[PDB]
Write a protein that binds this ligand. Structure first.
Ligand SMILES: [Zn+2]
Ligand SMILES: [Zn+2]
Lengths: 46, 178, 111, 361, 49, 88, 50
């Protein structure tokens, strides 16, 4: 299963598997965020 | 589906006991090709006209014949050494002769990825290019330690009979080919 | 106190260093006449390296052993012929030949 | 199981800050209430380690303690994390369990410290050169390698291979061509990221072209970074030499680095011949440095074609017509011996005996 | 900010040049780390200034 | 980090592991209720086969919270630090 | 960057020009909504460089 993440400075979609050194291509920044979910979320305007 | 290549034995090592005490001083004094230095080493080095042979004779009768190319050649060399010791004036005998180790060499005639080989057989191999250029493999069905080079040459050691080295090479050939 | 007896060395970079594995041996090669007289000494004595090193002051016993092993591994017929031929041990003429070899190497260094 | 209905549907459901293992079928409370500590209770419980509570650290000799302290000192000097320190001390204790290493030489145990540190460093994919290990360990490479082989054969621990890229990055960080220092002018100063990427591409090319296999990796790394530094500005660095670069960078020049550089330049010349415009230009080992970057753009097909038209030592590529000549089998054994003439010619004559006695008197 | 995110310390490597005598031969070192000093934000050596 | 324990009856994650993603880490944008796990962490008990026991990071809260971001960093000790930013 | 709850609150504060007399109150529950008592407004904006 392709797990995708986002770099802290490049903001590029990088695919890495489990037990890998957290890194991003064309850079060396070590902050990797997770993309927002695709599931439907219901919010109340109250 | 044989490999088609046969190794060549370059050394045969065998220990043999004479069964009697020896006087290394007189042995070295009454011989021309005798090499012995008690302060340096306690064995007399005997060399003969066999194709290649070195005997490390000791005072307890134990002597190790090395450098031979076959078991029969090693036995002939050991018997010649025993005859020389007898002619030197000692009751030497030829008892307890058994092949202790044999070193052989072979070539596969194609390059081998040492990193791939160690990654595939780490539990049976060791690769440290910073120390020795050859990969050291230790197999059990062969009962043999092997030095494998990138050029395709493999040196095998730690066997007792030529059949062991032969089956060792036959088993390791497909692994290196694959 | 050290009165400017030594000079500071700008070595041992704090970053990293590598290995050498080869320190001291650094042997010196032989020559044709030296090989001939070495074979003569072999025929005169045998394989005992102690006497050979004693009679060879300018060459090390370890180098002599290495040369003998190389000859045994490469030129076996020469060793067989050397063992076949025999010569009684000579001391005065051997010292004269040693002096001749010293003169020859001096001339080589001059060249 | 449930004491009432016998069902095994026991679920731990906390009901308003009340941990309770309750059956999911009938709701029968099996167990309820858990005994925790409180903060003042937690503060007044003192932290005592297993090293003291279990009973160890007392059946240890002064030699083992000195070895452990040396391991810790070297780990702190190298600035390795406490996890590395713990792994190193654990491996040192495991090696000390054996008697052969226990009753060994002082140099033997020093090299044992070094090899345990090296194994701990390798187990986490961390690059550390054995040369610096020996330099900081007060030992020689020969005995170091001998004891390393002995201990690895005695133990049989996993020995991960030294990754090339990590060592490349570690050695590139050593060079001072990143910040303009008083000695090095601004012309020699080059970009860090681009030069590191170029060196990584060059060392990957060397690894794929059978240049690092069998040979020391560090000379190849030095040759690759030198070629990268020259290619980033071929104009001002056409006259600079390997020794000059090593002197400028304050780095000990490896001996085979020159040979690795020559072989890599030959490979680059082959790649240029494979390319069209370069093969028309007819470059050489001195003018291909400006097009090395272009060689690395599509090096895949170039190396493929180069292998189509194996890298082996120069001593083997000299037209080996008779590979491993078959020796004549000579199994002539006679009956049991030959004669006594050889025995007599081996025996020393009285004249030679007296001459030897006079010489060695 | 990266230090805050990664739960590490924002410090600089303390280096020194020293000279000693190993075997009565003076050996000098131009740069050797000895510690790490936590750098205050917006200081002279801070990256924010 | 273990993946979401899917229920074989409905082929969907259980109510506790509902907010977890494919990698076992809760994804941003969803709502977190009381007694729900955020990271399905499992650690070995030995320190021959390793025996992992689960120690998930449950969310203790009276009201619901929404995950804004999930940062994953790696320290020098090969340790993965995961920080989830809950908003109310 | 704006929070989801703040965005929902701002959208709720936006008036609708629909005539309320033509609609009815939604019964208790029924989140799916029916044609008589619901109105759907889609908002899809993707910002990109010019
Ligand atoms: Zn990035
Ligand atoms: Zn029940």
């Amino acid at each position: 299963q392709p797990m995708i993440y986002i770099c802290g400075e490049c903001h590029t979609e990088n695919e890495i598997k489990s037990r890998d050194p957290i890194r991003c291509r064309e850079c060396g920044y070590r902050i990797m965020y997770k993309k927002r979910t695709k599931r439907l979320v219901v919010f109340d305007a109250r | 589906e044989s490999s088609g290549i046969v190794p060549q034995l370059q050394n045969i090592v065998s220990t043999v006991n004479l069964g009697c005490k020896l006087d290394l001083k007189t042995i070295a004094l009454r011989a021309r090709n005798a090499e012995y230095n008690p302060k340096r080493f306690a064995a007399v080095i005997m060399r003969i006209r066999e194709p290649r042979t070195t005997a490390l004779i000791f005072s307890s009768g134990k002597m190790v014949c090395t450098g031979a190319k076959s078991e029969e050649q090693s036995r002939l060399a050991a018997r010649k050494y025993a005859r020389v010791v007898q002619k030197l004036g000692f009751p030497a005998k030829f008892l307890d002769f058994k092949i202790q180790n044999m070193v052989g060499s072979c070539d596969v005639k194609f390059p081998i990825r040492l990193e791939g080989l160690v990654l595939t057989h780490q539990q049976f191999s060791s690769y440290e290019p910073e120390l020795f250029p050859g990969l050291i493999y230790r197999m059990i069905k062969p009962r043999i330690v092997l030095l494998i080079f990138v050029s395709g040459k493999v040196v095998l050691t730690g066997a007792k009979v030529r059949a062991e080295i032969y089956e060792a090479f036959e088993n390791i050939y497909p692994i290196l080919k694959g | 106190c050290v009165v400017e007896e030594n000079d500071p060395i700008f070595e041992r970079g704090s970053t990293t260093t590598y290995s050498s594995f080869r320190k001291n041996y650094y042997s010196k090669p032989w020559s044709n006449k030296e090989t001939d007289m070495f074979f003569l000494a072999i025929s005169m004595v045998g394989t005992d390296f102690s006497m050979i090193g004693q009679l060879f002051p300018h060459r090390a016993r370890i180098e002599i052993k290495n040369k003998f092993k190389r000859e045994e591994k490469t030129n076996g017929w020469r060793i067989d012929k050397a063992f076949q031929e025999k010569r009684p041990f000579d001391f005065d003429f051997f010292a004269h030949l040693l002096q001749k070899v010293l003169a020859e190497e001096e001339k080589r260094k001059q060249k | 199981r449930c004491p009432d209905c016998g069902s095994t549907e026991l679920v731990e459901d906390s009901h308003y800050s009340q941990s309770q293992l309750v059956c999911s079928d009938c709701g029968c409370v099996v167990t309820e209430g858990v005994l925790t500590t409180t903060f003042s209770d937690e503060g007044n419980l003192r932290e005592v380690t297993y090293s003291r509570s279990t009973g160890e650290n007392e059946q240890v000799s002064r030699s083992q303690q000195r070895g452990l302290r040396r391991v810790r000192d070297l780990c702190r000097v190298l600035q390795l994390p406490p996890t590395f320190e713990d792994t190193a001390v654990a491996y040192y204790q495991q090696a000390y369990r054996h008697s052969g290493i226990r009753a060994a030489r002082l140099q033997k145990k020093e090299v044992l410290v070094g090899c345990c540190v090296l194994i701990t460093c390798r187990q986490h994919n961390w690059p550390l050169t054995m040369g610096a290990i020996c330099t900081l360990l007060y030992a020689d490479l020969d005995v170091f390698s001998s004891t390393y082989m002995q201990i690895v054969k005695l133990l049989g621990l996993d020995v991960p291979s030294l990754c090339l890229a990590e060592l490349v990055k570690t050695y590139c960080s050593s060079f001072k061509l990143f910040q303009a220092s008083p000695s090095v002018p601004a012309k020699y100063v080059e970009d860090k990221e681009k030069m590191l990427s170029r060196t990584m591409q060059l060392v990957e090319l060397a690894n794929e072209t059978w240049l690092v296999t069998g040979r020391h990796p560090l000379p190849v790394i030095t040759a690759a970074t030198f070629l990268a530094w020259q290619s980033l500005q071929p104009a001002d660095r056409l006259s600079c030499s390997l020794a000059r670069f090593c002197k400028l960078a304050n780095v000990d020049l490896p001996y085979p680095a020159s040979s690795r550089l020559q072989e890599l330049l030959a490979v680059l010349l082959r790649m240029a011949e494979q390319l069209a415009w370069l093969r028309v230009l007819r470059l050489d080992k001195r003018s291909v440095v400006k097009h090395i970057g272009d060689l690395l753009q599509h090096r895949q097909s170039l190396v493929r074609s180069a292998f189509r038209d194996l890298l082996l030592p120069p001593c083997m590529l000299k037209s080996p017509k008779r590979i491993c000549p078959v020796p004549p089998v000579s199994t002539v054994t006679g009956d049991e011996n030959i004669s006594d003439s050889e025995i007599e010619q081996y025996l020393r004559t009285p004249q030679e005996v007296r001459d030897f006695q006079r010489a060695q008197a | 900010h990266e230090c805050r995110l990664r739960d590490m310390t924002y410090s600089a490597p303390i280096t020194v040049d020293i000279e000693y005598t190993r075997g009565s031969q003076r050996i000098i070192r131009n740069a050797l780390p000895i510690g790490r000093m936590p750098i205050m934000l917006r200081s002279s050596n801070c990256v924010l200034t | 980090v273990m993946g979401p324990m899917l229920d074989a009856a409905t082929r969907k994650p259980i109510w506790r592991h509902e907010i977890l993603d494919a990698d076992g880490i809760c994804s941003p944008g969803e709502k977190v209720e009381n007694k729900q796990v955020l990271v399905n962490k499992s650690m070995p008990t030995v320190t021959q086969q390793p025996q992992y026991k689960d120690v998930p990071i449950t969310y203790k809260g009276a009201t619901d919270s929404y995950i804004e971001k999930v940062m994953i960093s790696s320290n020098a000790e090969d340790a993965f630090l995961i920080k989830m930013l809950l908003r109310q | 960057i704006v929070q989801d709850e703040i965005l929902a609150h701002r959208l709720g504060l936006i008036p609708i020009h629909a005539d309320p007399r033509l609609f009815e109150y939604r019964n208790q529950g029924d989140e799916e909504g029916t044609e008589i008592d619901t109105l759907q407004f889609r908002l899809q904006v993707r910002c990109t460089r010019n």
